[PDB]
Write an enzyme that holds these catalytic residues in place. Structure first.
Site, mmCIF file in Angstrom:
data_model
loop_
_atom_site.group_PDB
_atom_site.id
_atom_site.type_symbol
_atom_site.label_atom_id
_atom_site.label_comp_id
_atom_site.label_asym_id
_atom_site.label_seq_id
_atom_site.Cartn_x
_atom_site.Cartn_y
_atom_site.Cartn_z
ATOM 1 C CG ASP A 141 -2.266 0.706 0.880
ATOM 2 O OD1 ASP A 141 -2.734 0.604 -0.273
ATOM 3 O OD2 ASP A 141 -2.827 1.355 1.788
ATOM 4 C CE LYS A 143 -3.352 3.271 -2.923
ATOM 5 N NZ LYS A 143 -3.555 1.999 -3.673
ATOM 6 C CG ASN A 146 -1.621 5.523 1.991
ATOM 7 O OD1 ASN A 146 -2.578 6.297 1.981
ATOM 8 N ND2 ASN A 146 -1.743 4.227 1.733
ATOM 9 C CG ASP A 159 -3.976 3.885 5.055
ATOM 10 O OD1 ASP A 159 -4.742 3.814 6.040
ATOM 11 O OD2 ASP A 159 -4.385 3.974 3.878
ATOM 12 C CB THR A 178 -4.760 2.448 -7.135
ATOM 13 O OG1 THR A 178 -4.893 2.925 -5.791
ATOM 14 C CG2 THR A 178 -5.586 3.325 -8.062
#
Lengths: 376, 144, 995
Positions: A141, A143, A146, A159, A178
């Protein structure tokens, strides 16, 4: 963990700071000392709209996230969970406060960043990733949204909901995140069930894509159709624009290319990446010994650099108003000003999701009958 | 892709460029080095050079910037001009050949505390034909 | 002793300065100079020094002589107060008239007369509106009563005071001329709101909350009763507009009084420091401070013998504002009050230099210092350098009294705790929080059974016989009898809506307990209470608001009975949202406040209780047949509307041979049947015929206006469109909306709903309204209809029908989606931007600079001359209005967006070059040149004619609209090239561009 009374009489909420899909961040103050924090308040009934199974699954996911985040606590660059309160209807997770928002706002305001801050950001991210992989914990995750920023340009990951432990010899076969940040292995596993899986390594491609988006200013892969974007990602034909990458060093391009490799085995690791010359620096040393050829080469290099600096300075060009009339995009300041003004004018249509993205602004394609050929 | 020897050579060259170890080139040091060879850029010229090399207006040069500048591939025409300028700097005497005395004088001007035996050994090792002089082909080949 | 000598000297100074002109019998001092008038504000302000001297004398008197001196001073103060009160009580008719509606013709005069306390001028020869004077008078009257100085004798005066309380309670939405009696910035007075009046009115209301006028020997009816909602509204208005005095003045020195010694009404101490620093840096001078920028009072220009300043204040009133040392003498008091001593010494030293010594060598404060008529040019280049000379009257009683009081207080004879016995100096102390109590009741047995099934324990409306519950409108009607007198022709408090702050507390009426439910669960006013989600949202907002302030004593109490409409369709279980809200209310957390539930029996012991004492005893027949036989809500509504319009405004239809059924009765009955089907297709239609009105609409309009925005009602084009630039009464607003809406009827309801939603959303998230300056309801409705039509790909009529059928929650969601902003893509985006004309945050500043370097900007004939640059300032609203008017000539939104982009690129390019064009620039020519260049470039590439289409009435290729803003092929490059070519066309064969 305890009764809600302890929270109630220990922390005093304050105004809102942000909003989410089902949670809102509020500022709180510690009584026995007046220290500021952030509290993530999670409603586990979904305002009374969820069926009991959804509530149970949400509670289990929150508990798993908490217990996974507990072990990693200690690193200066990770979010710190300070306190936890639980009820039948709410979780309260107390965290360090930041001050400014995520990297999304900074990138939108500044359009593009320089190499000076990129070096430090990438160093910190690589160190955190190396520590996480050493702890046998994956994230999946990574990104820009985040990452939090402090007043001194300090970024800490957060996150950790999607993070999960990976037993040795295992191979995950789940699809999440995503589409733009999905590695080829994830897509192949989703399409074909015979793929062994993907690994601690699928967390390099995300870093490479983040670096490319930070430098160029637009994501390497993006299209108005999901199928076309997936096909392009599978092909792996990332390209550098002509009047976009003419003022960058070759080391950065080489590092970016090394990060993005279709073959999982050939992808650079965190330890290997940290050894690249791009991060090379020196403090002090006096054990430099070599033969006469070394001294000759060093003297020649010094003389060549001294000669070349003046020529590089002289290579500049004037305003060339006639050039501006002909083509203003060639000059760097003109392009920078145009991009800044365009973003300021149409800066309220860039949000999360594949529907709207930064790449939707720039139009480098030569709009013509060539647009007829799109796909099969 | 560089190597350990290349990194060491670049670090040594950077250290030689900065006479006083501080961690920055410094405008005064840059001017001193420029004047050592016989060049007198003006203060505005030095400021423009520093601004062009640096990515911001801090007015200082660090090791990463030097590494990036020295890692560029200059092609042939620009590389040919740079090599010609370097030879002319080394070819102060109108003879077209490099001798031990010229190299020793260049090192002394650059601030090198060497010895006659060391310079003689260096020239002998560098030379191939054994005539005591270095030609254009040898200089270009040794540049790499 | 030294103290005695100092007191004697101060008494001598006061006697020689102020008391010498007391005008016996009347007790009112002349208004300084040879004017022969008595201004209310000055008379009130001139008594503080005498009051303080008497207070100091009283404590240390211990002797017959000092006793006599204190008695005389107190008698003088009482005489002055009574003399002032006589003039106000002589004009009861004006107060009674003003209680209803708001106008300047029915306002009390501001300048009363000498002996015989008569009128001197009419109602059309002065500005007779000053809400600050009455507010300060009431504040000081309340303060003096607590000290122990009787000022009220008869009981009839209590009724007049109570009526006067309602005269100023509407100061948060009433425009006044101002403290300076000059209206807005410029002359030709137009009523406008200012922060000083509301700030001074807020303090007065709080002081008289429970202060009896009979001292410690009062009776059951001796205390003035005031509400709480008005105080909170005034506080919110002050906080919103605290930095700026009004919408026309950037800064005013009068804010010091609001944020200083008199009438402390401010929170968020950071604001106090910010405003003080702003005043110091902007208005400080050499021998005083100016009231505000560009005031021409007592100037060598302006032709003093003329009024109504002509609009020619270009530079004739710049940097020559004379002075006003009153703002200086306020600072010493402000500093010495709380904790400042070095500041006090500095300001005392500064003030001592600008003093003038007159007869007997005593302090005298000049009014202002005027600039010499000759040395005027130098000041324009060297501001605050040329010496000035005294001018105008200088028997300033106000400033002299304030300075004397400040000096006496600094000497240490009197302490800060004596002047303010009410302890108003502790308004900056934070209050931690409050706990909200909530009680749930069941309407009938079935509701109780359903609640107990799910584990919720409650009690029915019965079983609580000693306690009773009824709506809030009954309470509002009951409050319309306070302070009612027949002999003096007083009608008591007018009817008004009741907020949550009033219903929460308990009440006592003739040895009984009463509780009133909140006002938002009333289904007899509008249909906004028929949606459960709306009910939950309003409940959460009310809970947060109540938990926020709660400046009363004791915990609050809220009653939320469950009605029959809160059940599901089957009527056997409460809705999911209601159950979730009820469950969340437990566990002590809901919304943003702590909520504790229980039973009224326990809450009775710990809850605020109010004791009320004033309540104690002292062929149409064929059409009717068709309507009766015909069915369907559509036909029923159609026939009812036709009958009402033609012959049935109140005529009896005679449908029932036994009961006389009027058209209104049948229409009201139809609501009962419509409400069960939840058919939002005619509920709005029927509401139009009955012409229902939303309560608190004026409050929402005022809140919207206070944020520096201009409203607009009525679809385009002009002159149908209106402009509500100032607050208007409820009746005025309703009639204006009806006139603008024409006969559409439903348009009025939609406009009211949109206004309510916008007002609701403004408070929570005041960040989505950026990049917007004018709000137009008609354009918003048209945009919503077009968006719905595009989404459904249906006709305009179908889209309108679908929109009319949307529930309030759906309408709110659609409005939020539209506001947030979340071929066919870029063209739609450009059209949406143009419809709402979302200009950047700094468009006007860039426009003004360029104008500074050109002769104007012509747009299809109309020209914006550059001369307006010196006639206005970028911060002013007139320049923005003119710019928008010039830009709005073209009807196509895409053309507007293209023109905005062209202006922005021209502004950006103008910086590079260093020259003056000296010519008028046409944006349309630049746009056309860019379009031609793009067309030629596309033709060169080889694109076929189909791609390069032409607009029907614009002349611009469609692909240009779709082209992205930035990039190597975007419209910005073409616009820049066209602008450069146009500039070169009018340049002396040279650019000299360098940056």
């Amino acid at each position: 963990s305890h009764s809600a009374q302890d929270f109630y009489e220990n922390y005093e909420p304050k105004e809102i700071l942000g909003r989410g899909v089902s949670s809102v961040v509020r500022r709180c103050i510690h009584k026995p000392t007046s220290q500021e924090y952030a509290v993530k308040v999670i409603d586990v009934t979904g305002g009374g709209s969820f069926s009991p199974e959804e509530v149970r699954e949400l509670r289990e996911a929150t508990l798993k996230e908490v217990d996974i985040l507990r072990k990693v606590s200690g690193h200066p660059n990770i979010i710190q969970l300070k306190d936890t309160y639980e009820t039948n209807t709410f979780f309260f997770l107390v965290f360090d406060l930041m001050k400014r928002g995520e990297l999304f706002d900074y990138l939108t305001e500044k359009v593009t960043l320089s190499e000076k801050e990129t070096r430090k950001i990438m160093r910190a991210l690589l160190e955190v990733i190396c520590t996480l992989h050493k702890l046998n914990i994956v994230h999946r995750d990574l990104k820009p949204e985040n990452i939090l920023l402090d007043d001194n340009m300090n970024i800490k990951l957060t996150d950790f909901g999607f993070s999960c432990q990976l037993e040795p010899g295992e191979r995950l076969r789940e699809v999440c995140g995503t589409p733009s940040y999905l590695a080829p292995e994830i897509i192949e596993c989703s399409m074909n069930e015979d793929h062994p899986g993907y690994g601690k390594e699928v967390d390099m491609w995300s870093t490479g894509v983040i670096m490319y988006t930070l430098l160029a200013g637009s994501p390497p892969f993006w299209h108005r159709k999901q199928m076309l974007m997936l096909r392009m990602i599978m092909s792996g034909n990332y390209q550098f624009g002509s009047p976009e990458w003419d003022d960058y060093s070759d080391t950065v391009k080489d590092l970016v290319s090394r990060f993005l490799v279709v073959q999982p085995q050939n992808r650079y690791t965190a330890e290997e990446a940290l050894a690249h010359p791009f991060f090379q620096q020196y403090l002090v040393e006096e054990v430099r010994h070599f033969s006469p050829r070394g001294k000759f080469k060093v003297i020649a290099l010094t003389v060549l650099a001294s000669v070349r600096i003046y020529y590089q300075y002289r290579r500049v060009k004037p305003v060339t108003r006639e050039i501006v009339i002909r083509d203003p995009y060639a000059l760097r300041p003109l392009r920078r000003l145009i991009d800044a003004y365009a973003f300021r004018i149409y800066g309220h249509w860039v949000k999360k999701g594949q529907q709207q993205n930064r790449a939707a602004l720039f139009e480098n394609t030569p709009k013509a009958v060539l647009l007829s050929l799109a796909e099969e | 892709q560089l190597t350990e020897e290349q990194i060491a050579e670049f670090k040594e060259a950077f250290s030689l460029f900065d006479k006083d170890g501080d961690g920055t080139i410094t405008t005064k040091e840059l001017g001193t080095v420029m004047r050592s060879l016989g060049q007198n850029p003006t203060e505005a010229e030095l400021q423009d050079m520093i601004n062009e090399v640096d990515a911001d207006g801090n007015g200082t040069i660090d090791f990463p910037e030097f590494l990036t500048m020295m890692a560029r591939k200059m092609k042939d025409t620009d590389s040919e001009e740079e090599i010609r300028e370097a030879f002319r700097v080394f070819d102060k005497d109108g003879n077209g050949y490099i001798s031990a005395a010229e190299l020793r004088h260049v090192m002394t001007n650059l601030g090198e505390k060497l010895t006659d035996e060391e310079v003689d050994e260096m020239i002998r090792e560098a030379d191939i034909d054994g005539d005591g002089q270095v030609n254009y082909e040898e200089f270009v080949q040794m540049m790499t | 002793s030294n103290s005695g000598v100092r007191l004697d000297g101060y008494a001598r100074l006061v006697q020689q300065t102020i008391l010498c002109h007391q005008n016996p019998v009347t007790g009112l001092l002349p208004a300084s100079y040879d004017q022969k008038d008595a201004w209310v504000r000055d008379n009130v302000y001139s008594i503080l020094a005498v009051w303080g001297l008497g207070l100091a004398y009283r404590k240390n008197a211990d002797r017959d002589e000092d006793k006599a001196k204190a008695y005389e001073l107190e008698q003088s103060v009482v005489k002055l107060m009574r003399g002032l009160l006589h003039c106000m009580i002589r004009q009861v008719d004006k107060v009674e008239s003003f209680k209803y509606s708001q106008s300047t013709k029915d306002s009390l005069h501001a300048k009363y007369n000498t002996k015989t306390c008569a009128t001197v001028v009419g109602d059309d020869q002065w500005g007779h509106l000053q809400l600050d004077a009455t507010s300060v008078y009431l504040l000081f009257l309340a303060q003096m009563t607590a000290s122990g100085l009787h000022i009220i004798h008869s009981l009839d005066e209590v009724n007049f005071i109570q009526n006067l309380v309602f005269y100023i309670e509407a100061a948060y939405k009433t425009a006044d001329f101002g403290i300076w009696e000059r209206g807005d910035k410029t002359n030709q007075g137009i009523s406008e709101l200012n922060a000083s009046s509301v700030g001074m009115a807020k303090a007065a209301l709080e002081a008289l909350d429970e202060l009896d006028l009979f001292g410690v020997k009062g009776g059951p009816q001796s205390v003035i009763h005031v509400l709480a909602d008005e105080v909170q509204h005034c506080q919110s208005i002050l906080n919103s507009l605290l930095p700026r005095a009004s919408t026309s003045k950037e800064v005013d020195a009068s804010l010091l009084s609001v944020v200083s010694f008199p009438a402390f009404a401010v929170e968020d101490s950071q604001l106090v420091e910010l405003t003080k620093q702003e005043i110091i840096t902007k208005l400080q001078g050499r021998y005083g401070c100016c009231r505000f920028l560009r005031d021409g009072y007592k100037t060598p220009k302006e032709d003093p013998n003329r009024l109504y300043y002509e609009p020619a204040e270009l530079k004739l009133f710049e940097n020559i504002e004379c002075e006003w040392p009153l703002f200086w003498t306020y600072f010493i008091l402000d500093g010495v009050f709380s904790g400042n001593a070095e500041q006090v010494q500095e300001y005392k030293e500064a003030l001592e230099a600008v003093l003038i010594k007159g007869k007997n060598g005593v302090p005298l404060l000049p009014e202002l210092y005027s600039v010499p008529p000759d040395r005027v040019d130098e000041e324009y280049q060297n501001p605050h350098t040329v010496d000035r000379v005294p001018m105008g009257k200088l028997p300033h009683m106000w400033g002299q009294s304030l300075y004397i009081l400040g000096s006496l207080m600094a000497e240490g004879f009197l302490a800060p705790g004596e002047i303010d016995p009410l302890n108003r100096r502790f308004s900056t102390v934070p209050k931690p929080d409050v706990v909200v109590q909530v009680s749930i009741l069941a309407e009938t047995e079935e509701i109780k059974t359903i609640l107990k099934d799910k584990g919720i324990y409650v009690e029915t409306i019965a079983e609580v016989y000693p306690i009773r519950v009824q709506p809030a409108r009954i309470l509002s009607h009951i409050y319309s009898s306070l302070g009612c007198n027949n002999r003096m022709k007083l009608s008591g408090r007018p009817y008004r809506h009741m907020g949550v702050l009033g219903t929460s507390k308990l009440y006592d009426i003739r040895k009984t307990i009463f509780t009133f439910t909140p006002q938002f669960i009333d289904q007899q006013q509008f249909y906004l209470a028929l949606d459960n989600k709306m009910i939950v949202e309003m409940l959460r907002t009310d809970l947060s608001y109540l938990c926020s302030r709660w400046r009363m004593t004791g915990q609050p109490t809220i009653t939320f009975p469950i009605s029959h409409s809160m059940l599901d369709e089957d009527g056997t279980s409460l809705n999911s949202s209601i159950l979730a809200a009820l469950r969340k209310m437990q566990d002590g957390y809901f919304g943003g406040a702590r909520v504790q539930t229980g039973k009224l029996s326990e809450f009775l012991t710990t809850s605020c209780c109010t004791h009320l004492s004033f309540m104690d005893p002292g062929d149409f027949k064929a059409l009717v047949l068709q309507l009766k036989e015909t069915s369907s809500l559509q036909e029923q509504a159609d026939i009812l509307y036709m009958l009402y319009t033609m012959k049935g405004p109140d005529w009896n239809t005679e449908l029932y041979n036994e009961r006389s059924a009027t058209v209104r009765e049948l229409l009201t009955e139809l609501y009962g049947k419509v409400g069960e089907i939840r058919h939002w297709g005619l509920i709005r239609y029927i509401s139009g015929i009955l012409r229902k009105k939303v309560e608190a609409l004026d409050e929402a309009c005022t809140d919207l206006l206070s944020h520096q925005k201009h409203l607009t009602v009525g679809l385009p084009p002009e002159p149908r469109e209106k402009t509500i630039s100032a607050p208007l009464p409820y009746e005025a607003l309703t009639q204006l909306i009806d006139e603008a809406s024409e006969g559409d009827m439903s348009i009025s309801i939609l406009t009211q709903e949109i206004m309510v939603y916008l007002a609701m959303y403004m408070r929570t998230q005041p960040g989505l309204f950026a990049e917007m300056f004018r709000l137009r309801i008609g354009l918003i409705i048209q945009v919503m209809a077009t968006e719905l039509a595009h989404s459904l790909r249906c006709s305009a009529e179908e889209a309108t029908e679908g929109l009319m059928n949307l529930s309030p929650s759906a309408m709110k969601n659609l409005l939020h989606h539209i506001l947030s902003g979340k071929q066919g893509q870029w063209q739609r985006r450009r059209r949406l931007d143009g419809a709402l004309n979302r200009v950047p945050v700094g468009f006007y500043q860039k426009v003004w600079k360029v104008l500074q370097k050109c002769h104007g900007l012509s747009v299809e004939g109309f020209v914006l001359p550059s001369s307006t640059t010196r006639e206005m300032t970028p911060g002013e609203i007139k320049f923005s209005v003119h710019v928008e008017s010039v830009l709005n000539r073209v009807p196509q939104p895409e053309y507007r967006q293209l023109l905005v982009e062209a202006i922005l690129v021209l502004t950006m390019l103008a910086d590079i070059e260093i020259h003056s064009i000296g010519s008028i620039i046409a944006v349309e020519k630049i746009v056309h040149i860019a379009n031609d260049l793009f067309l030629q470039e596309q033709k060169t590439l080889g694109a076929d004619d189909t791609m390069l289409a032409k607009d029907p009435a614009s002349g611009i290729c469609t692909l240009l609209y779709d082209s992205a803003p930035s990039g190597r092929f975007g419209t910005m490059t073409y616009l820049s090239k066209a602008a450069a070519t146009y500039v070169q066309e009018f340049l002396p064969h040279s650019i000299c561009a360098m940056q």
